[PDB]
Amino acid sequence: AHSPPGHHSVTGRPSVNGLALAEYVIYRGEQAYPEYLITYQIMRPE
C-alpha cells in the first residue's frame, strides 16, 4: 500500500487500553534500518 496522501507513515494509537503504546506503519522499506539484533528468552513469572 501507500501512506495517506501527504503522509510518510501511519501512527496507530490504542484508545481503549491505556497502557498499550503506539504502533507505526511505513510503506517504504528504505524508511527503516535494523540497528540492533536482540537475542533473548521470555521468563516464566515466579
Binding site: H7, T11, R13, P14, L21, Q31, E35
Partner: protein
Amino acid sequence: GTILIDLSPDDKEFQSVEEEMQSTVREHRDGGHAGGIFNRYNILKIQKVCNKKLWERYTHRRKEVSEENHNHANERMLFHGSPFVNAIIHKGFDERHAYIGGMFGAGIYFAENSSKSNQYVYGIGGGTGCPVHKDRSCYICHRQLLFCRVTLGKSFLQFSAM
C-alpha cells in the same frame, strides 16, 4: 555486506537497549496466547547491525522525507519481530515484510512495546510457536527481535479500538 558486532553487557549502549526492552513489556489482551506469559526477558545477546549499503539506503530516504516534511525526519527507535529477521539484517526491509492484513494498512509495522513485537517473532498470532516445542510461550528456545531506526516523517494519526 552485513557485519554483526557484539555489545558488552558492561557497555552503556547494551544497558540502554536492554532497558528499552524490559521497560516496554506490557500485558496483552490475548492473555499471552500469541507471545507467551511473561513480565520480563532474559537478554542473551545484543548485536549492532552494520551494513554500509543498507545504511546509505536509509539515510538517502531519510533526507528525502525530512525535506518533504520541512526539515523534520521524525526519527524513532522502535521494535520489530519477524520470522524474516535474518533476511532483514542482510537485505534490508522491503515489500516482503509488509503485513497485508494489518489494520492500519498494508505496510511494515513497528511497535513501542517490545512485548507487542514479541507476538510476531514466530509469525502472525505467534504462528505455531517455537520450532522445537511448538510452544508460543516457550521459556527454553532463544528468540530474536530487532530494535530499528525508523523515519516517520509526517505521520497520520489513526486511533484504534485496541
